[PDB]
Amino acid sequence: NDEREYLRHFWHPVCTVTELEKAHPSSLGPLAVKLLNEQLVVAKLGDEYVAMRDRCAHRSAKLSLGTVSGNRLQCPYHGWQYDTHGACQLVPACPNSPIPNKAKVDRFDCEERYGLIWIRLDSSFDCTEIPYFSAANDPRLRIVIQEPYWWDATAERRWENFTDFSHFAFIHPGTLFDPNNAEPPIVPMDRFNGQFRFVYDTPIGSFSYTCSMPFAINLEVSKYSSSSLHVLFNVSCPVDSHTTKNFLIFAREQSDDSDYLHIAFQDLVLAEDKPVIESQWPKDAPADEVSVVADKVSIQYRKWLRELKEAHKEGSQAFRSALLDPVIESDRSY
Amino acid sequence: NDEREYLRHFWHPVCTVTELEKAHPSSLGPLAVKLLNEQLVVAKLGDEYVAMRDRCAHRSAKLSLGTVSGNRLQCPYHGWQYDTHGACQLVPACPNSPIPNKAKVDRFDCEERYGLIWIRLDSSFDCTEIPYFSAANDPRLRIVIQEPYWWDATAERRWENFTDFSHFAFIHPGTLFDPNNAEPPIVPMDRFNGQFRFVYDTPIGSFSYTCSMPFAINLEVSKYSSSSLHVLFNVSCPVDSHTTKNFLIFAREQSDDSDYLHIAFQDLVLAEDKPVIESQWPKDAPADEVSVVADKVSIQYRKWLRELKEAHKEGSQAFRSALLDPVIESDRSY
Amino acid sequence: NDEREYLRHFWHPVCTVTELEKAHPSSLGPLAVKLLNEQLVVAKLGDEYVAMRDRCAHRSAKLSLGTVSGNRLQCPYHGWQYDTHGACQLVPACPNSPIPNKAKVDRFDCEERYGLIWIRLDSSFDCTEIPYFSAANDPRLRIVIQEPYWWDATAERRWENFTDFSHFAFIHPGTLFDPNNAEPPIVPMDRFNGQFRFVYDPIGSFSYTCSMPFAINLEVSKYSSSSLHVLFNVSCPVDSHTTKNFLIFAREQSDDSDYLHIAFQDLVLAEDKPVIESQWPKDAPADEVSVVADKVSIQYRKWLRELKEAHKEGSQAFRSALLDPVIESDRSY
Amino acid sequence: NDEREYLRHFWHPVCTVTELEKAHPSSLGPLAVKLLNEQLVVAKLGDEYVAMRDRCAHRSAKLSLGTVSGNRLQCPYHGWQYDTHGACQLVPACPNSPIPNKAKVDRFDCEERYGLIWIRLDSSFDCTEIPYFSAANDPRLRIVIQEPYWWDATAERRWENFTDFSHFAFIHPGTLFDPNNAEPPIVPMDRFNGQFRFVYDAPIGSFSYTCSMPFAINLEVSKYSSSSLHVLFNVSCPVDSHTTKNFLIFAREQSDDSDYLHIAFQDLVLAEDKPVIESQWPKDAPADEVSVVADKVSIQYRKWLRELKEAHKEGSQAFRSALLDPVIESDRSY
Amino acid sequence: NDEREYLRHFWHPVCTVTELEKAHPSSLGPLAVKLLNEQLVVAKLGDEYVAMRDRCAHRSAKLSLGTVSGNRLQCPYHGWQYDTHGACQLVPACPNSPIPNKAKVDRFDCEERYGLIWIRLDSSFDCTEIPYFSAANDPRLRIVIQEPYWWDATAERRWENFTDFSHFAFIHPGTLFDPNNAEPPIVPMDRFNGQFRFVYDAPIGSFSYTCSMPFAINLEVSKYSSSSLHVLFNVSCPVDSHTTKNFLIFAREQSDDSDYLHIAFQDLVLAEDKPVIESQWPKDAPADEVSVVADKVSIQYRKWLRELKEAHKEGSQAFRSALLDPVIESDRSY
Amino acid sequence: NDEREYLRHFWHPVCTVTELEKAHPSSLGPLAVKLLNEQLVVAKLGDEYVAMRDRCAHRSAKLSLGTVSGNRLQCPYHGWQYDTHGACQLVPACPNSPIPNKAKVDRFDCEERYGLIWIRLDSSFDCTEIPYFSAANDPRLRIVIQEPYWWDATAERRWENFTDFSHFAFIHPGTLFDPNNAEPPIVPMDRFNGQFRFVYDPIGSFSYTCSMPFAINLEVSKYSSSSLHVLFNVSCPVDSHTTKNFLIFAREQSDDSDYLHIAFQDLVLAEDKPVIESQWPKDAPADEVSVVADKVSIQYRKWLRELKEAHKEGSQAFRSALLDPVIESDRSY
Ligand SMILES: Cn1cnc2c1c(=O)[nH]c(=O)n2C
Ligand code: FES
Ligand code: FES
Ligand code: FES
Ligand code: FES
Ligand code: FES
Ligand code: FES
Ligand SMILES: [Fe+3]
Ligand SMILES: [Fe+3]
Ligand SMILES: [Fe+3]
Ligand SMILES: [Fe+3]
Ligand SMILES: [Fe+3]
Ligand SMILES: [Fe+3]
After folding, report:
1. CA end-to-end span of chain E
2. How much is the CA Rg of chain C, to the nearest whole Å?
3. Of C56, D52, E211, F44, most Cβ neighbours within 10 A?
4. Which positions does UniProt annotate for [2Fe-2S] cluster binding (chains A, B)?
């Protein structure tokens, strides 16, 4: 728990906009979500997406069992009404008495982007941004948001599974494995603007990764001589110590085919990964795991996470430098 | 059964395009559907949506358990390949022998329109068209296709439920009932181009019905002084003697709000109707039902159905006249 | 199909009063019930229990999905209101217009007795009565109405199971079998007032009063003691293969727990249930082979056959077949 | 936790007499019950209801799987028989040998009252009594004992829910809320004989509460100029740290109507409360909850419970005074 | 329908001996079984397996709920005891009275062979025998009786599935399909002694079929220059018009490996067939099915079944000739 | 937690050979098993049954989701291949590079005997053996391995249930209770070769050879007859509250059905199961009260305590506590 405090400083996705709209017939929420083992409630009050602790200040009922009425979230028990800042503005039992100063619940940064709702629990370092999705606002690409998928595995283990190629022959022999490539070689990895950037050439094409730390991956798959750009954007919500809620958004230039051709293929790949990733134990990678040279991406990821954790302990400027300082291995200029 | 043969001459919806694409990972089908108690299979072969009897000519296996490979539907048992016309073009066991002339399955009219797949089982009268949806190709309106809903009631009983107002105070008191209107009066009903056309004024607005016989309803709800056009398009697939698969498509001019605000409200209305309509017995309306003057729409609907049934027995020209001749009660010019 | 028509002339229980009051939060019903494959609705309108066909005259919705509103049963669909005679008295869409003459639904005899609701589908012969329960109005006895139990067996087969002793050694060896009696003898059987009456004994007594066709009143008494126990069992013939069965029991010594008796009765029923449900075909064919020990069921089947034949001959023949006395015993009635 | 030790000194209901009689075919029990996380067994041994620890002294089998034999409880495993004092009186394997001195199990004060079975786990302070039910032995009233209901909420939170009126508009708008009363004013509350007493009302009627501390509530509802007395008696069994088994007994003077009219209504009320009360978290009310002036009853209840917990730590005399000393703020003469 | 009458003249398997022994704790049965829509009961009475109608002559209870007592089957209801001939020999209620002449139930020819129980419902033609299993009494072979498997398909369609090779590439591509063989050529088929005999093969091995009409298949798979004989014996019980209970027995010369290697493989093969065969409709093959030259085995099978059905209508002598007359088209000397 | 460490020194059954062969279509495994709360994987590599920790050294995936490939167990994730000693011998991503020294997983003793797979987690004291089953290699007897049965009870409580006669009247009144014996007397108990040996009788004999700590070999013989019946029951201590129990039975007269015996044994187990599962806390506390009839369990508990204490003293103390003879009877060994 002590181990995870630095993660409160990043933006994490908690639901799709669709999930929020489907939660209650109002289409405005509320929706209960859980992030880093914190119980939160999300709602649309007026034009704004709001995130609060899911716990009424009065008698601790869950506001996620309440009702959105315009610009208020009403508690289901004694009807206290909370505004967009988390402050109670109506105590129905005492409508003329002054509202206690303590009648407020914690309110957190909450923004929509790419069709997902993002929450940042701690904004005090003021140096993190919502992860980068390269296909946003590209009018050449059709964008599809998949339904979220829940895994009994941590966000770190999910991230390392997504960026590893070594497992293709064994987990994805008929779906992703390329017998003409088999073992892609180690590549240079750059840190830039709080992202890992690395590229694999096929060259006939390229797999270009832009990974916004700590849990988001933007993968651009391109081919020359063809206009066949495909973008996969994967991000894991660290729900608690053993669970992730995962979001996949994909974009494609050739969009005359069915969205479900791609959804079904992506779901097959995920079904192949799922039982093996969920089997990994203990849930957090212990020091006794044995790496080999082909594990470069995982090794460098673990190293940067540990540096962020240590920098968080030293405070805001140390964290901003650990996250945002460039570290270039490649021949590229950014 | 004898009673339902005339319905084979109309276009009936059997699935959404989404359902077809989701059926199999290929995104091309096949999908088993049932229409007028006939077992059919739908697939996308090349650019074309095809509908065939779901029964291989060889040993009667279901083609809906097979596989679409480009422009062929392959039977799952001995791999006979059927083309878009229902004709077997490959017998894998006898690849050099001539294919028997009998190695063909019945192929039916099948067209996509409005995001649904429509089938017409008998095209011999050559005088029916896919029902009219007024919001198609209107760029002012956002269109949403709901997931189909299955009811243990007939298409006729569903149609009469959708066009009746008398039940609002009792089934829809908090959703659709207007205590300021309560009992809308009987209105003139026109037959034109195989549609029932009738309008109710509110006037502050109007509910304008265009009902393509026998089972489709297009309802335009408009208000003057506001750009608040709403269109509801409801059509029932007569699956068998006691079941319907129902499709709702809705369009709206003011589209800044959530689609799920409307979906949830429409689902609530449907949940209020469902148990009462499913309770009606026997499933087909018998002669002993007692009508009152407020039942005009239902009475006139039943009369036109009976005329179509009788005209079908007399043949193509009689049916075309029964369906397409105008019969005007209103002051309108069409 | 036609061979059960004569059963429509009798009163049959369809539910407990408790089931009716629990069906809807108003405690007035309506409750859907099924009797001889007829779909019926029961409701309490004012002081009257009413039973109608569960089908509105307008568009055939089930009235059992509707609401009781004072002296009316209101259809859930378009709100037609039916009075206690099954006649529509309000068409909300046309409140001024005359109500069509056809706007009526069939209404059936419906009466509460003993805490059960009874329906008689055909009252034309005017000669049947609600079965006799001997403990009613006896202040010495505590009466308990058990929850109904459903069996995949006909009412005739259930009746013959209840009145047979031959099966105790094989079905009830630890519960009802008496190793020192084993084979109770054939006893005389009387027909009186539409009831079979017979008695099995100088210490005790098992006294049966069976109101034809499906009700059994069993009085168990012990001489030199005041320990009267009454069992009243009656089967509702729901359809051709199903019964809904009611058991009411009364006892003089009532300082013990009701549940001592309920648990024992439920154990006995659970022993009978799989064997009776296995009997096939559901209705006893003419090829069943009887022995002398089967006197009760032989006589039962003979009287039922007489009632079926008399029903075809009409009202007076049926009244005679049902109510004429036929006395085998020494007892005076 | 050890914060609960003081509750062991009170009488708590564990089952209805009906539940005991139904548990076993003999109608004498045994029945397993749980109270303050203790596993107990109840049985009728002769003319007495007896409560013992549900654990045989021999090899720790549950006596609740055993049988009542005469006036003793017989273990299911090797047949040891325990008397009403928890002492073993027969060891079937060694019938003539002396029974070990330690062959005994703890027993607890156990009494029937009002059709419930009550247990007091710690009788050493000897100053608590079974709670007061005002309708007992009043022949004008028909009494109905409802079946117990289980909630995932503590007895303290259940008590505060039962005595609060503030929540009616939000949880019970169609069942209990009175639009013409809305917010009853704060009333004086008296402590007398281990009970909270307070009354709500020219006044037409009265809501008169007698609350036997800590978890029992007797509510008399009367109407002046009418003879329609209604009594609700509600008491929660604290089963463990997060669970209650709850008993409702209701009495009414006007009794020609159906018991199930009232049972259905009470069940609807409970179904409305249940999800909101179960959502309150953490399960025990923390110090950070925010009260308003309308919460007087809850505030005073928590204050008295705190006093009882502190007095328990100082011993029998302090506890007796904290419980039984009167504190009057109304003008009622007692 | 009455099209099935002729099948009553053959021996059909109804259960394994294992199933009979497991049915009841005594290991003697009774076991209820169903054959050609007849409800029967099987029991071990003394040294004999006996089949009776599952219906007591007294009050029609199922004897399969009863018990074997000595060498008799005792009804569960009033304890009548039936001997191996179906005759009642004890009426417990009337132990000294004469037993009614009609106190008897129909019994049927019933024999154990190969670890299965076989029943012949109509023995009046007396010209059929229990099917041939070639591995019985061959000490070189280890025999395994699989658990029966139930399919929603007729015995005729199951037989044609078992003997067809055409479907391997499509139903069994990873299990049975041989890319280097693909389409075995048509072979001569012999009728001899009520069996179809045909062999598939310088040739390395052999697939040798002996098919005891109508539903049993003995397949010997051998490899020349090796001692790896494998035998598959498959027989379908026609339970009713749309259901089969199927028995597979397999024998192998090479037997150091695990039985479950083979059981797992056979189960996978059956799981591949099952959905396709169950989809065939209507359940009985109609005249409109289209055969090709590769279907010789199925064509000849249907032709012989038609001859047996027609000969049955002409009587015992015609049936015996249709079944047992030889028709040789190979050059094998028998 | 620490009080069960000494159990790691014994051989425990973890599965039948049948369960291993059915786990994967290859019939070679792998199969996940749990023993003393350790997660293990069992597989057949060549002619050897192997048991490893179910956790790859690379990224901690479960090897039980992998595949046997000849003489290797292959991890499902990145395909590392482990030999019979638990050492990785192929890293497919780096086929030329040297394999890290840390690329090994723990490997445990694993042996087939009697149709069960046995694992010994700690072989350091080198003095324990797979329990004795007397019917093995006896051509006169037919041997049947039952399917394992899982109970929510510890292996010690299961052992004491199996060897107690006192409970027959109360748990097994219709199956095992003999009304003409009722209370079998205390008998002498011998410790020999790490087994408890004791005999109950001049017509018959119940002869127990109990290999410590959890295995029971029971020979039931009848003098002047050739009807030897052997029951071999052994409990796998899966975790702190669960056992996976194996029953093997052998009989001389084997012309009857295996299922006559299986059904009877299953009936006896179903009678014990709810009572044994109710015992709480799961491990017997020191406050349990014994009587003289409890001699078998008293002596059992004493020997287990001696083994636990000796384990703390080390290898020679444990060997002595386990294998030293302690003879109470007249018999010669
Ligand atoms: C007590 N009890 C419970 N069920 C019954 C009896 C009985 O006494 N006779 C009897 O026939 N039946 C069916
Ligand atoms: S708990 Fe939220 S208003 Fe009281
Ligand atoms: S059944 Fe379709 S190819 Fe044979
Ligand atoms: S169906 Fe009953 S009022 Fe219309
Ligand atoms: S455990 Fe209770 S008598 Fe032995
Ligand atoms: S029904 Fe079989 S003995 Fe009576
Ligand atoms: S986790 Fe086993 S090879 Fe990587
Ligand atoms: Fe993967
Ligand atoms: Fe409606
Ligand atoms: Fe009985
Ligand atoms: Fe409430
Ligand atoms: Fe096959
Ligand atoms: Fe036992």
Report:
1. 37
2. 22
3. C56
4. 56, 58, 75, 78
